[PDB]
């Protein structure tokens, strides 16, 4: 995963976009940091991801009303998905701190990374839905 491409839309005051970039950067940050890190360090990293995720979700809540009825369904479903994904991520994080300095620690991290990476893929996916819904509204041929 890179931070997201920019397609044809102007992103200067694109909040959805800014926030998705935030949440994506935060996942990447955590990932590069994990394997060497004690719990004193990895719990806050995961806190950060949740914050960036809440920020994104409120931004989105505000944008729905401005986009066509036809599109609302998916945008909500794709929202659920990201709450779910974070659910999964916290699970694996509690398991890894439950299992520190044991042998099974590190498969517990491999499961954190797996879930963090779905979170970021699904963020990027939300972006696309939103963009497509805008393009519709702005009147794309």
Residues that bind Na ion in the complex, under the rule CB under 5 A? 68-69
68/87 with CB nearer Na ion: 68
66/101 with CB nearer Cl ion: 66
Instruction: Work out what residue 68 binds among Na ion, Cl ion, none; the CB cut-off runs from 5 to 8 Å by kind.
Output: Na ion
Q: What is the three-class DSSP state of 62?
A: coil
User: CA 118, CA 122: separation in Å to the nearest integer?
Assistant: 6
Interface positions with Cl ion (CB under 5 A):
15
14: which 2 tokens?
A: 């694109």
Instruction: Work out what residue 15 binds among Na ion, Cl ion, none; the CB cut-off runs from 5 to 8 Å by kind.
Output: Cl ion
15/117 with CB nearer Cl ion: 15
User: CA 29, CA 70: separation in Å to the nearest integer?
Assistant: 36
Q: How far is the CB of 83 from Cl ion (least distance, A)?
A: 20
Instruction: Work out what residue 124 binds among Na ion, Cl ion, none; the CB cut-off runs from 5 to 8 Å by kind.
Output: none
66/101 with CB nearer Na ion: 66
Residue 138: C-alpha distances to residues 9, 61, 132 (Å):
11, 19, 10
Contacts of 88 (CB under 8 A, 6+ apart): 115, 118
């Amino acid at each position: 995963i890179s931070p997201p491409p920019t397609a044809n839309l102007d992103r200067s005051n694109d909040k959805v976009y800014e926030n998705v970039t935030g949440l994506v950067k935060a996942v990447i940050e955590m990932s590069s940091k994990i394997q060497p890190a004690p719990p004193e360090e990895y719990v806050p990293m995961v806190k950060e991801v949740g914050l960036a995720l809440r920020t994104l979700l409120a931004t989105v809540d505000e944008t729905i009303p401005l986009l066509p009825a036809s599109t609302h369904r998916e945008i909500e479903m794709a929202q659920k998905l990201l709450n779910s994904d974070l659910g999964e991520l916290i699970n694996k994080m509690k398991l890894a701190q439950q299992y520190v300095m044991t042998s099974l620690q590190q498969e517990y991290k491999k499961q954190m990374l797996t879930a963090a990476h779905a979170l970021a893929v699904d963020a990027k996916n939300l972006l696309d839905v939103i963009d497509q819904a805008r393009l519709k509204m702005l009147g794309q041929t």
